[PDB]
Design a binder for this molecule. Sequence first.
Ligand SMILES: O=C1N[C@@H]2[C@@H](O)[C@@H](O)[C@H](O)[C@@H](CO)N2C1=O
Ligand SMILES: [Ca+2]
Length: 738
Amino acid sequence: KDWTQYVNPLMGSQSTFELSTGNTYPAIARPWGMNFWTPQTGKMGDGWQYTYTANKIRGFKQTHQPSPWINDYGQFSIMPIVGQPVFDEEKRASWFAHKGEVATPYYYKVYLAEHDIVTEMTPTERAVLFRFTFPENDHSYVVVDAFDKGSYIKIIPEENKIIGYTTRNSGGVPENFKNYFIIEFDKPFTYKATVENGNLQENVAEQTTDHAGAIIGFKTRKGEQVNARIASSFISFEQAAANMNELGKDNIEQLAQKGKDAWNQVLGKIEVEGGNLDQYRTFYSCLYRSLLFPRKFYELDANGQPIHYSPYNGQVLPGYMFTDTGFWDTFRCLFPLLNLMYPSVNKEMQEGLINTYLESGFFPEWASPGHRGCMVGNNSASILVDAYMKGVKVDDIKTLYEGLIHGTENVHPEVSSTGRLGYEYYNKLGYVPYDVKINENAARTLEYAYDDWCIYRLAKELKRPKKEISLFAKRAMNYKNLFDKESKLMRGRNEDGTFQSPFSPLKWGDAFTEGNSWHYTWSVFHDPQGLIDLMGGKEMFVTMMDSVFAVPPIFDDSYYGQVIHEIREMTVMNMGNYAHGNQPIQHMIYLYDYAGQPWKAQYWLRQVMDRMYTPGPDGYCGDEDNGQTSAWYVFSALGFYPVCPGTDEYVMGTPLFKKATLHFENGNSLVIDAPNNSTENFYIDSMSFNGADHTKNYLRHEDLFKGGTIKVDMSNRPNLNRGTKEEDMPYSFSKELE
Ligand SMILES: O=C1N[C@@H]2[C@@H](O)[C@@H](O)[C@H](O)[C@@H](CO)N2C1=O
Ligand SMILES: [Ca+2]
């Protein structure tokens, strides 16, 4: 049974700076591939490296880029051509169309109109096989671009080989950073020239220069297939040569199929049925996107043991290592999806995190490949703890604990988004002041508070001294310190203790991060009852939640000086202030469950699943962000969501398919049966879990792992009585102390 047929790698590529519909590129790769490959439409250096609207392809690129904002490293490209041998990235470019293009997660094909050449490629974790089909011609060449900012290239004719290294990067790299690559052709060169800063140097074997390049060529007869075996490494040329064995002796088709099996082996852990083709495509495309980042950043040694170039100190060290994720996005539901469906993969990730801390002094927040200055919060604490509480345990709990503590009282000296910016204020005043020139201070405060709740949880589980437990228990309630009784919202707070004036809840940025108070106020994943309590009780809380959907999408962009795409994205949806396009509010709807109106969540979640996700190139309503916006759909379509990582709970929403089946790593399975599900039947009239009636609005990790069957009675009417009792509510820190 093949699920790859549903995956559309182009979903997200019809995106512009002014309005995101995903901001993705076609990532032709294995699951968590160390090296992704992609057609390249944009010019070198542009974060929009492939846009669906582009007329021309200028190369086939090894890329690691996690987003057009973070940009790229370890990047070089290859491009077959005919006619004059040109290195220029514009002159070598060829028209193409999508009806002449085939994109799968394991295989990519395209017809380059102006060269009359077909290109195909199938990657492994670290290597890729290209096959170029050339027309009849005296002058057929292949261009190899090592990119600029200091690269290297050497042609080695007596082995039909080219080698090189690329360094162009967007920060986050040690001084010795290099991506080492090798390229073997199966046809001898009849022409060879290296390129040096735009200059063609025929029969000059090698260059070390700003922008190194190489062009090789030959005579071709009609339909002649030239294959290139490619691999790279962050360690060395000798390791790059070892990586090339990934390719075995396979040709395109045999590799494609091993690639397709690899993907089916992971997509197939979740089988959905009983929906339309749109839904299958949207679901499995989203699932695929959730299985890409963070990337493997280790390589296999001669004995098949994991080793890695540290992007933190530049040494080569044994053990796991991953990168290219921003925890500010991915703590929310992406890493949780991994603890549920792929625990053994996140095991390697956590081992990796431990290695990051040993090698750099901090657990990372945004990493690409080393520490990068981007976003806010200390949400690594949530990643680390949620894993552990879910049975994904690192070997060195001692180091784990120390690293957590370390980041609660240090910010990284060159990367302000690593450790906690403004911890001093936060540890003393219980919040980050609005007026001390630390932006996004209210956002930092609410996340730090949650992050401390997680640490509290781990302190507790580990039998730490009551004094560490208590200190984090207290800090966990730090969200109270920004709550404004009048507006019933969170609000920037001055160093002296007075709230900032004037206050606009519609202002984006400033106190908050790419959102406004209406988006950020809900960031109390560990204690919604505490937030209800703050607002005056469930009814008022509900009244506030409704407003988010009902108010016009007015805004205040002064902080940014332009209508950034996250704002635009929100405005166009006609969903009030509900900005699903950005991470901070993405859990909000499930909150209804906590106030005893689960039917409202069910309504709104289906509106989102139905309207805000489509399977085409313009598929998302905002940035995808490395699994987060996608895993959201995956979770929601199954019918529940990790509102609060660190707990063992998944908060109930409403399933999208008539039947979904989870195959867990432990050999057990779980069938979620919604036989009456339909376009109109989105309310849950009742549930049962293995014959036992289930009224609660949450599911426990441990129970799901046991397997069996959950039955969902779908209906078009809201059941005003199910899920309203105190015992039906998911976890809030305020409750407890019990
Ligand atoms: O301008 C940016 N938009 C996105 C953010 O919204 C955030 O989701 C990403 O982690 C982060 C990195 O992609 N981003 C930016 O820097
Ligand atoms: Ca975003």
